[PDB]
Design an enzyme around this catalytic site. Sequence first.
Site, PDB file in Angstrom:
ATOM      1  N   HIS A 146       0.810  -1.213   0.000  1.00 48.22           N
ATOM      2  CA  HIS A 146       0.000   0.000   0.000  1.00 48.22           C
ATOM      3  C   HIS A 146       0.843   1.261   0.000  1.00 48.22           C
ATOM      4  CE1 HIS A 146       0.941  -0.612   4.211  1.00 48.22           C
ATOM      5  NE2 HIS A 146       0.579   0.635   4.454  1.00 48.22           N
ATOM      6  N   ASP A 152       0.420   5.082   1.720  1.00 46.46           N
ATOM      7  CA  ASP A 152      -0.357   5.527   2.866  1.00 46.46           C
ATOM      8  C   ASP A 152      -1.474   6.481   2.475  1.00 46.46           C
ATOM      9  OD1 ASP A 152       1.168   4.085   4.890  1.00 46.46           O
ATOM     10  OD2 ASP A 152       2.774   5.488   4.474  1.00 46.46           O
ATOM     11  N   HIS A 199       4.718   0.259   0.144  1.00 50.27           N
ATOM     12  CA  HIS A 199       5.491  -0.569   1.058  1.00 50.27           C
ATOM     13  C   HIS A 199       4.669  -1.734   1.587  1.00 50.27           C
ATOM     14  CE1 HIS A 199       3.752   2.651   3.588  1.00 50.27           C
ATOM     15  NE2 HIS A 199       3.720   1.760   4.562  1.00 50.27           N
ATOM     16  N   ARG A 215       6.455   6.794  14.712  1.00 50.44           N
ATOM     17  CA  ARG A 215       6.297   7.360  13.368  1.00 50.44           C
ATOM     18  C   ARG A 215       5.877   8.830  13.406  1.00 50.44           C
ATOM     19  NH1 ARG A 215       2.881   7.177   7.905  1.00 50.44           N
ATOM     20  NH2 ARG A 215       2.989   4.902   7.631  1.00 50.44           N
TER      21      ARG A 215
END
Lengths: 276, 276, 276, 275
Positions: free
Chosen positions: B96, B98, B252, B267
Site C-alpha cells: 500500500h 499511505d 510498502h 512514526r
Amino acid sequence: SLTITPLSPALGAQISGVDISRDISAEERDAIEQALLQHQVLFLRDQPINPEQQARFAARFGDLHIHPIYPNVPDTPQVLVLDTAVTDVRDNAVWHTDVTFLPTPALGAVLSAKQLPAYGGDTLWASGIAAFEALSAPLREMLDGLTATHDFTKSFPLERFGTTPQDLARWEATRRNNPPLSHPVVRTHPVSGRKALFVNEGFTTRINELSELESDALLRLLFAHATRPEFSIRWRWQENDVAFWDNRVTQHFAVDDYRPNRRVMHRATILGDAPF
Amino acid sequence: SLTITPLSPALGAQISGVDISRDISAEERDAIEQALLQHQVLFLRDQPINPEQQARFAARFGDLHIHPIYPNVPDTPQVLVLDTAVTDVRDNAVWHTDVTFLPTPALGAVLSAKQLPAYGGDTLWASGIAAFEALSAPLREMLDGLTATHDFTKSFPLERFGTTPQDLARWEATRRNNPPLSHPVVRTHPVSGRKALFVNEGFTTRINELSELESDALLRLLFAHATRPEFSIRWRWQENDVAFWDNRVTQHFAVDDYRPNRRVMHRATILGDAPF
Amino acid sequence: SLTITPLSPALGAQISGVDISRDISAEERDAIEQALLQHQVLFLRDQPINPEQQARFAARFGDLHIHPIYPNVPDTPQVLVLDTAVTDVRDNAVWHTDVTFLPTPALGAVLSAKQLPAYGGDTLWASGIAAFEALSAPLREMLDGLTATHDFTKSFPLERFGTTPQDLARWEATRRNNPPLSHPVVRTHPVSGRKALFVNEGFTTRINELSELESDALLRLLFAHATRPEFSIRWRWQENDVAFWDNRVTQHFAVDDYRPNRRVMHRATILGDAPF
Amino acid sequence: LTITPLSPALGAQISGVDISRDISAEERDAIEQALLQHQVLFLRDQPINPEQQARFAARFGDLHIHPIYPNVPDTPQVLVLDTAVTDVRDNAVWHTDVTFLPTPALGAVLSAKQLPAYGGDTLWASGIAAFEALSAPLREMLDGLTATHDFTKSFPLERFGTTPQDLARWEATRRNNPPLSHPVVRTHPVSGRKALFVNEGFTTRINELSELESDALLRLLFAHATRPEFSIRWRWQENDVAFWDNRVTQHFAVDDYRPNRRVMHRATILGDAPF
Ligand SMILES: [Cl-]
Ligand SMILES: [Cl-]
C-alpha cells in the site's frame, strides 16, 4: 567459535567464526550441514577463497558436478565461472529451482562473489517449506501427492535460443536430450523429511492430474504464493561473499538491474537425487 | 561528512555521517531532501532518537500531522507510538501507499525502530518511478493521463468495522467523511517532476476510464508489475534504525512473520498536497 | 401427449403438448417435475398465459414469493413485472444464481415473455451439475465439503445503488437485513441428490476455508469453468415463451444487447429451502 | 432473397435463394454484403451436394484443397469431416482458422450431412463487436500493435508423439510453419471494419508488450472477446449451411455428443495477408 545467525523466520542464516579457505573440521562440517537442513540458505561474508578451496569446501556436502558446456576453472573443473562479460545469464532473472527438468536436480550450490558492481544484482531465495506450510489445509491436502511436468524449454524457448543456425542446432539437441518429465508437487526433503512445494515458474509447465485449465490456474496461484515476502529473503552481495543453498526445497531469483556493469561469480554444484 | 550509499538502482539509500538527534544544518537538510528525491526511501542505522528529536527532524521536510486516533507520545503528539502491546496491524502485509484515499495523501514519514523481535518484521518498499519507467511504451502511453478511484473501504470493509448497528453507522460516518475519490494513475512528483505509477493494492479499486472487467485485469497486472523484485528493496530492521520515505511515489509492505512478538516503532507523518 | 426434447446433453429441454394456461393434471405436473430434475431448465413455446394463470402454474411446484420492492401485477402480486421501460435489468447481465445471499435461495422461477425486441436479449443458463462432474477428481475432492460466503452487495454495490438518499437508505436496510452468509461450494440437490457447483460470480465473494489469495484464484477458475460452452445453453426468446428453471443447480445470464428497445417479462419465483 | 438478423453482434439467416443452383451476380453480391455486415450466415433446409457446395463457395473466393483431411474425390475442394473417421475435438477451443499462416483462410462454408439428435452446437464470436466494446483507451493502445501466432500453441510436441520419427515430423512442420505476426486489430480488407484479431488457439504473444504484460492483456482479450454479448450459438439441423468470415470471427464447436456420428462437408476459401 562457529556462529549461526538466522536472518528470517522462513529461511536464511549467516555463518561466521569459520574460515573455509582451509579444510573445515568434522564438527564445523556437521554444524553447517545442520544449519543447511534448518535454514536452507547460508551466507558467509568476508570469506575470500580460490576455486580449489571452494571445491574442497563444497565437496564436504556431496559429490560435485562438472558442467560440459559452461566456462570452467581449468585446474578445478568443478568450479564454473559466471562472468557477465562472457556468458548469457537470462535464465536467472525469473523464479526457478535449478535444473528441475532433470530426473535428479542439483542438491544445491556454493556461490562465491568475485567481482561486483557497486550495487544492483541482489539475489532472492524463497522456501518451498515455509510456502507449503502456509497453504490452507484443503489445498495442502489436494496438492500433496500430485505430480507436475518440468520442461527446460520453458526457460530456454526456441524464440530466444534458436535465432541463428548454430544456436538452433544447439537447442534442438538439448531438447532431444531432455524430454519433459515429472516430479512430485510436494517434495519430502530426503534428509530432514520437511515437506516443500516443489514447483517453479522457471520450469514447471503442468500439474498432471488436473486439466489444462485447472492446472494453469493452480500454478499461477502457487507461483505467486510461493514467492511472497513471507517466504523469502533478499541478499545484497559484497565481494568475497559465499552463498550455500539447498536446491531441493528453495527457489531463487537473480535481479537483472546492473547491466552493463561486470559481475563475476564462481559456482560449485552438488549432485542431487530423485525427488520424492 | 554525510555519506549516501545507494542500496539498489531502483530505490533506497543508507545515510551515515549525520547525527539527526540534534538540529541538522541547512546543507544536511538539503542533502537528505535531494537524496529523498533521488532514492525515495532512506535509512540511517545506529541513530537513537527520542520523540521530540524525531519530530524536529521530520518537520524539516514538511508540516507534521497529529493523528486523531492512534496512540502517540503525549509530550510530542506528532509522534505515533506503534506497538504490539497497544496495537494490531492486519493492514500492513498488503502492498500500500499511505492514505491514498485522501485528497492529499501523506508526503511521507519518518519511522524510528525502538524495540524489535530477534528477527522477522522486515519492511519492503517499491518505486513507482522505476516501475513506471519499466512498463512497455504502449502501456505507459495508455496509462499516463488515466485516473483511478481510491477507497479506504477496500482495506477497511464493513465486516471489519463489524457487527452492531453502531458500527454500520460509524462506518457510514467514516465513508461520508472519506468518500471514494480519484487520483492520476501516473503521478508527476510535485518536486522532482519524475513520473510514477500511483496505484496500490491496499486502496485502488478502479481505473475510471476502463470498464470494470478491463480495470480488474489492468490493476492485477499493475499490482504484480510494480511489486517485482526489480523495483523493490527489503529492509531488515535493527533497533535505532530510522527510515524516511517519500509516500508520493512508493508503496510498502510489512512482512507478517513475527507475531506475536513485540515490535515498537515511532512514526512521524508529513502532510502532502494534491497528486497530479 | 407431453413431449420432452433435450436441447443439449448438459441441460435444457423444450416441453410441448400441455396447456399451462389451464390447471394441469397431477400426472402432467409430475412429468414436468421429473423433466426439471433431469434437464434443469425447461422451455415451452407458444404458451400465452396471464399473470393469474402463471401464478397457479408456478405454485404447483412450490410456494410463491411476494417480492417487497419490485413492481408486480396488482391482482396477482406473486407475478413480478419486469418492464425495461420502468425497471433497469442491467445487473442480469452477469452470471448469477438468484438470491444466493439468502439463507434459502429461490428454488426456481417461471418466466413469461410478453414483449420482445425484434432480436437481441437472449438468456443463457449453465448447469452446476455438468460443471461439477467435469472438474478433475482432485479438485472435486477438495471442493466437496468447503463452504463459501455470498453477499448481496457484490451485485448491488454502493457505487451504483447508494447514490441518492432513498437509494442509500434502501441499500442500508437491505444490508442490515442480509449480512453475508455461507452455503456449500458443492450442493446436493435436495430432491434428486445430484451434486452441483454452487458458486456464482454475482454473489459469491469467498471460499471460507481457503485464504483470500487462494480463494480469489479458485473462484476465478470456477467462475470461468462453470460458464464454458460445454455446460451452457443459449435461449433466443419468442413472445409467449415460458421458461421454468431450477435455481438450485444452475446459473443464468441475460444478454444486455437490445437497449433502448423495450422488453417485458413476467416472473413468478418459487421459494427454496436451505442448501446442503 | 431475405436476410434475417439473429443477434445484434453477429449472425443472420438467409432464405429465398436456392444455393444448390448457380446464383445471380446480384444474389452473390447481396450475400457478400450480408457476410460483411453479419459475419456468419445460415441457411436452413438447403440440401446440397459437393459439386454445388464448391460452386457456391467459389463465388466468394478461390478454394483451398487440404493436403491431409479426407475430401470428396470428384470435388476435392470439399473436405469431409466425419467423426466415425476423423477426430474433431480440436474444434472445441475458441479459435480463428489457421492464423499461424501468413494468409489465414478468408472463411468457410459448412453443410451438415448427419447429426446427433442433440449436442454438437457451434458458437461464433465477432471480433468487430468485441473491438468496438473495448473502452477507448484500450482500443487506442491495441490498434497498431502486433501479435505472434504459432501453430505449436494448439499442436505441441506431445501432440505429435514421443518417437524420434514424431519429433522429426514436428520439427519439419515447425520449419514450414514458423511463428509469425499479425495486427492485433485487423482492418477487414473489404469492409474496412476493425476487429480484434487474436485467438486462444494460436496467439502466443503481443509483440510490443513485455511477456508479463502480454500474458495479462491476452488473458483479458481472450475472455472479453468470447463474452455472450459478442457471440451466437447455432443448434444444427440436417441440411443447414453455414458460411462465415474467418477474417473477423472466432468459433468453437462443442464436443458433447460422442460417440454419436456427426458428418459435415466443408469448403474453405483462401484469404490474404491481414493488415
Ligand atoms: Cl469447421
Ligand atoms: Cl462444426
